[PDB]
Every structure is written in C-alpha cells, then in structure tokens.
Structure 1
C-alpha cells in the first residue's frame, strides 16, 4: 500500500460501461484498491454481478450514495489506505502504460495534481476570468501555451486533499452543489493555495480514449475568486512525456 494508489470511480446510468472499465483497471500494476461510488440511488448495486465474475486482483468497494451529488467522490472514504488517489470518469479508458508512468511521476511530485487533461483560465478585462483550453490565446507574452489546471477526472493526487477539501469554506461547498459540477476547479484552487506551486503537471497520454459546462466553469472561477479573495492559479508550460516510449521519441 505504501507504493500504490487507490482508484476512485463514480458512475451513474453506465453499468455495462463500468464493468468494462473495471475489467481493464483491475489489471493495472500498483493498483491497491477500487472504490466505486454508486450514484444510482434506489438501484441494485452491480456488486453481486462483479463478485459472480471473480476472482479479481484487488478489492472493489461499491458504495451506494445518499443522493446523486458530484462532490460525493470527493468525500473522504475510510477504505482509502494509499497516499495516492487515481480519479477516472466512468467513460474514460486510460492505458496501463499511461497510468504506470503518470503514477511514477506523481510519486516525485506528491503534492501536485498529475494528470492527462490540462486546462486554463484567461483574462481580457481586469478581475474577470474565463475558462478554456488550447482554443484560447495564451496568457504569457511568450511562446507556446499555458495551463493552470489539470482536471481531476483523469489524474493522480494526494488523498489528503480530499480531507483538505472538506475543510474548505462552506461558500465553496454551496457552489459545488449549486452547479453540480466545478469540483476540479475548486480542487485546483485548493491545491495551489496549499503548495504555492502550479496545482498540477500535465502528463501527455499515449493512449487515452473516451467511450464540461464551460460557461458554468467560467462562472465558478469568478465565484471562487471572491470566496478565496483572489486568483491563485499559477500558469505552467511543462508537458511531461516518457523517455523512449514510444521508442526513439526523444529525437
């Protein structure tokens, strides 16, 4: 458990999907345990089915949820024993190769969000911020582009941040529930304020496949700026790839 991570996955109305993903993820090296946030209330959990198709490499804990909230996966689950958490949306398939590499990167930067989906905030009028990706002009006056966030939906991060998230101003808790989204934007804020460093590091995926309420995202950023009284997100243009994978990719 000291050299592994816990996969936390939230699902709703995607069962045949969930099981397919699980078949994949259960086999990834260094995976210590899986927690399946069962968001389909008043519905029979797929746990009986999962067990019927056993044995499985690791324990899988299915957890029925009170309501159908987004920040539910951001809860502090007592069954998480690892220092690293791997959060993946129930519609995303990330290769073992990518996970093994990204986890090894997270181990060297334990206090940052190591992930495959980078995003950023921009400003063209003082004090007002907007949410976007590479379709938006870069902030810095220099070359390339910048990112100030790494979405948690496909990332590795310290489990302590989930506990830290619970201690955030209620104002933030409201916002999350009010928009039924924006969690990762709140997490990126949290992490960067805690570390004084860019909230995350972008690890370019070699094989990630998908089987955002942009406007609300922007809205959330400005709201959050009030709450935290400022914009703490730090830009970064660091993109990490695995040396020699694919072969000769260094030249």
Structure 2
C-alpha cells in the first residue's frame, strides 16, 4: 500500500471500454487496487466475467451505486488504502509510462493535482469569468499561456481530498448535482484553497488516447457560482509544464 496508488474509475454505459481499459491498467506498475464506481443503476456488473478471466495482478472492487451522479467517484471508499488516488474517465487510455512518471511527480508534490489535462478561467469583465483552454487568450502575465486547473478525469491526487471534498459547503454539493458537471472545477477550487498554491501541475503526456453543448456553458456558469459561494476567486495560474528528462531520448536538446 506504500508507494502505491489506487485507480478510481467511474463507469456509465461504457462497459466494453471499461473492460478493455481495465485489461490495460491492471498491469501498470505501483497500482495497488482498482475501484470501479458502477453508475449503471440497476444493471449487473461484469465482475463474474472479470473473475472468470482471472488471475489478475490486483484486486478490482466493483461498487454498485444507488444513483448516477458525477460525484460518486469522489466518495471516501474504505477500500482505498493508498495516499494517492489515480482518477481516470472510463474512455481514456493513459500509457504506463505516463502513469509511472506522473505518479513519481505526485510523490514530490503530494498536495497538488498532478495531471495530463490543463484548463483555465479567464476574465474580460470585472468579476465575470469564463472557462476555456488554449483557444482563449493568455490570462495576464507575459508570453506563453497559463492554466489554473488540472481536470481530475486524468490525474493523481491525495486521497485526503476526497474527505475534504465531502466537507465542502452544501451549496457546492448542491451545485454539482444540479449540473452533473463541474466536480473537477470544485475539486480544483478546494485544493488551491487548502494549499494556497496552484491547484495542480501539468505533466505533458507522451501517449494518452481517448477511445470512442450546454456542457461548456455549464462550466463557465459553475466557476461564477463557486466564486459567489466561496466569495472569491482562489484559482492560481501556472505555466509550469513537466516532461520526463530523456523520455523520449534526447528530448532535452
């Protein structure tokens, strides 16, 4: 359980992908256990099929959920024995090389969200914010760009943030259920408020693949709602992009 991480994968109507990803993730080094947050209410889980195809390198725990809520993966599962949690959406395949490297980065910054997907907030009207990525102008600073959030759907973060998440104002939880979105924005708000540092650090992935409209609109909406509830914009910008020295070979020159 020491120097190991736990994979928390929430799944919904993607069982075929889930099983394929599981076949990949079970073999990643330093993986201690897998927790599948089964959000398909009233549907039999593929655990029988999974075991019939055993043995497997680590225990995979299927936890049936009473409702299909985005926040289910953020609960404090008793089965999690590690200090770090690896949270990945059930449609994303991240290479073992990216995971091993990112995990080693997390161990050096255990209080920050270490991930592969950076995003930001911008403002063009006092007190009004917008959610976006590199298609939006850099917020403030000089050259280059900035990110103020690292999405939890492809990251490593301290398991203690799951508990701290549960302890956030009811207005925050209310907001999450309301939109069935923005849980990662909430997590980023929560982390930076706890540390006083940028909520996360962006590690550029070498091999991460996705296997496959009011969504983005809700994103901006949530940032503004959260600013009201917390009575302030706590997110901090960063332009730190970490890559692995020598991987690929000679990438330093």
Normalized against structure 2, the TM-score is what? 0.98
Which shows bigger deviation, 37-46 or 201-210?
Answer: 37-46
SS of aligned partner of 2:135: coil
Q: Which residue of 1 aligns with 2:112?
A: 112
Deviation at 1:23, TM superposition (A): 0.3
Deviation at 1:2, TM superposition (A): 1.2
Alpha-carbon deviations, 1:28-51, whole Å to 9, x = none? 000000000011111111011100
SS of aligned partner of 2:73: coil
Unaligned runs of 5+ in 1: none
Q: Which residue of 1 aligns with 2:195?
A: 195
Which shows bigger deviation, 98-107 or 211-220?
Answer: 211-220
Q: Which residue of 2 aligns with 1:220?
A: 222
Q: Which residue of 1 aligns with 2:146?
A: 146
Alpha-carbon deviations, 1:155-183, whole Å to 9, x = none? 00000000000000000000000000100
Q: CA RMSD in A?
A: 0.7
Alpha-carbon deviations, 1:7-59, whole Å to 9, x = none? 00000111111110000000000000000001111111101110010000000
User: What CA distance in whole angstroms lies between the structure 2 residues aligned with 1:44 and 1:162?
Assistant: 27
* Alignment map for 1:1-251 (pairs within 5 Å): 1-211=1-211, 213-251=215-253
Q: Which ranges of 4 or more aligned residues in structure 1 deviate by more than 4 Å?
A: none
User: What CA distance in whole angstroms lies between the structure 2 residues aligned with 1:244 and 1:165?
Assistant: 37
Deviation at 1:122, TM superposition (A): 0.1
Which shows bigger deviation, 92-101 or 203-212?
Answer: 203-212
Unaligned runs of 5+ in 2: none
SS of aligned partner of 1:71: helix
Alpha-carbon deviations, 1:174-210, whole Å to 9, x = none? 0000000100000000000000000000000000000
Deviation at 1:213, TM superposition (A): 1.6
Alpha-carbon deviations, 1:99-156, whole Å to 9, x = none? 0000000000000000000000000000000000000000124010000000000000
User: What CA distance in whole angstroms lies between the structure 2 residues aligned with 1:141 and 1:115?
Assistant: 23
Aligned residues: 251
